[PDB]
């Protein structure tokens, strides 16, 4: 029966970490990634932004960064002028760009599939455009850029994201306002970017969705909504986005979760089924993901909320106004909706947990076969 | 997340007339107020006139009596007629706009602007 109880933790690591659709841990984890990305979805288009470099007032700057969900958009457009970015203010182009790499990572990889907690090594390509216009726009030339000829120049780095070695193609290409093709006849330079072999997994992805929210809430630029004629109304519709103080303090705490939630995994690793010691560990860490995963849950779940922070969830960033597309979909009607699967990932992770009964039981079975044993 | 564009600049005669033009886009619902600016190349710039989503206009003592200032909220655009020209006219027009974070600020300059248009008398 000591064997018997070993079978069964086996059993339920591999229902934790290898499986997905059916993993609790799974879905926790992708709960709090989707509910970030959703958070942005929801609010980036009513947030300004502007500047140049080095986060100065622009008269001129106008900078457009491509597939995000901007007002009747595909891109968000950062053109406020005159006023310097910060605090309540607009947010500045530095911010936006750490902001726009992760919100790409994550739309690409959560578009191709988070693989299982225990599969640690894949990776993802990431291709991303933005552009400049203006006069006295810096925001796309070499100091910010890289690039030696912003007229077709192309500079390949290596960096690090995740403590993994991520190759960086950069290219940069004018469109005068002359040019065949360009409507909006001025001028702009474009600017590309390809991260080749970015991290997608669990851990990494939280990052992401960390680095993500951090940004806003550090950030904090103003913002003005516009309500829809129907359904459910966000009010007041102007202030500042770190004002958002319950959903960014539920987000991030969803993401520490789903953080510890990644720890446990290695422990089961480093122990797969004296030897109490490590029947202990494991069960122990089994009992954990299960905990933190209804945790993550519970703290999202519309029925433990209440007004404001309840009507955000169930009118808003628990939707997808995209016309009637998968994880990483950006339309022209993705703003001032979450467009990232929470409701259907709060319903699933809630039914993993529903049809786990029966490990919850064994995995605490064992916990005490384990623990008597170890004295 | 507003975007303005003019057009109509020329040359033109004094005592004549222009219209200038500017297609607002992006997020129009955050905007309480649009205007004209404009700066010649020696001068200070100088605000023109504005439009206060109440329809309630404010013109700069220089072209009241001589210039109009006028929406088309059904096309988005901005209109600014102007007539009897003077040399002195001649400058850089600016088509801009008033977001709703400069709401109780009564001084505050437009803090969105296109990249302006030439009009030379």
């Known amino acids: 029966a000591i064997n018997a109880a070993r079978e069964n933790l086996g059993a339920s690591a591999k229902n934790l970490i290898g499986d997905t659709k059916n993993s609790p841990a799974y879905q926790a984890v992708l709960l709090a990634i989707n509910a970030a990305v959703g958070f942005w979805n929801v609010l980036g288009y009513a947030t300004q932004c502007g500047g140049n470099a080095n986060g100065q007032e622009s008269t001129s700057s106008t900078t457009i960064f491509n597939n995000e969900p901007g007002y009747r958009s595909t891109s968000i457009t950062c053109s406020l002028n005159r006023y310097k970015p910060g605090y309540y203010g607009p947010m500045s182009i530095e911010n936006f760009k750490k902001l726009n790499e992760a919100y790409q990572i994550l739309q690409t990889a959560l578009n191709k599939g988070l693989p299982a907690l225990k599969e640690n090594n894949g990776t993802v390509s990431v291709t991303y455009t933005y552009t400049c216009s203006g006069e006295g726009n810096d925001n796309c030339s070499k100091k910010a850029t890289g690039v030696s000829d912003q007229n077709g120049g192309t500079k390949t780095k290596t960096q690090t994201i995740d403590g993994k070695t991520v190759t960086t193609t950069i290219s940069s290409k004018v469109v005068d306002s002359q040019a065949k093709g360009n409507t909006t006849r001025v001028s702009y330079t474009e600017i590309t970017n390809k991260l080749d072999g970015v991290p997608d997994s669990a851990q990494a992805l939280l990052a992401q969705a960390s680095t993500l929210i951090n940004t806003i809430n550090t950030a904090c630029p103003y913002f003005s909504v516009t309500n829809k004629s129907g359904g459910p109304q966000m009010e007041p519709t102007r202030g500042k986005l770190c004002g958002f103080t319950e959903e960014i303090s539920a987000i991030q705490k969803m993401i520490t979760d789903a953080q510890e939630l990644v720890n446990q995994t290695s422990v089961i690793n480093e122990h797969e089924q004296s030897f109490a010691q490590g029947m202990l560990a494991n069960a122990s860490a089994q009992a954990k993901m299960l905990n933190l995963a209804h945790q993550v849950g519970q703290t999202i779940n519309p029925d433990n909320l209440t007004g404001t922070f309840k009507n955000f969830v169930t009118g808003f960033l628990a939707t997808c106004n995209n016309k009637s597309s998968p994880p990483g979909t950006v339309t022209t009607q993705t703003f001032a909706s979450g467009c990232a699967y929470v409701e259907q990932t709060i319903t699933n992770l809630n039914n993993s947990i529903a049809h786990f009964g029966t490990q919850e039981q064994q995995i605490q079975q064992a916990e005490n076969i384990a623990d008597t044993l170890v004295n | 997340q507003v975007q303005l564009q003019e057009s109509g600049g020329g040359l033109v005669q004094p005592g004549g007339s222009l219209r200038l033009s500017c297609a607002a886009s992006?997020?129009?619902?955050?905007?309480?107020?649009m205007g004209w600016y404009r700066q010649a190349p020696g001068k200070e710039h100088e605000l023109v006139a504005t439009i206060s989503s109440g329809s309630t206009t404010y013109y700069a003592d220089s072209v009241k009596g001589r210039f109009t200032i006028s929406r088309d909220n059904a096309k988005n655009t901005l209109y600014l007629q102007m007539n009897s020209l003077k040399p002195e006219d001649t400058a850089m027009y600016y088509c801009?706009?008033?977001?709703?974070?400069?709401?109780?600020?009564?001084?505050?300059?437009?803090?969105?602007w296109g990249q302006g248009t030439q009009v030379t008398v």
């Open positions: 992006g997020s129009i619902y955050s905007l309480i107020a």
């Open positions: 801009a706009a008033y977001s709703d974070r400069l709401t109780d600020c009564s001084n505050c300059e437009a803090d969105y």
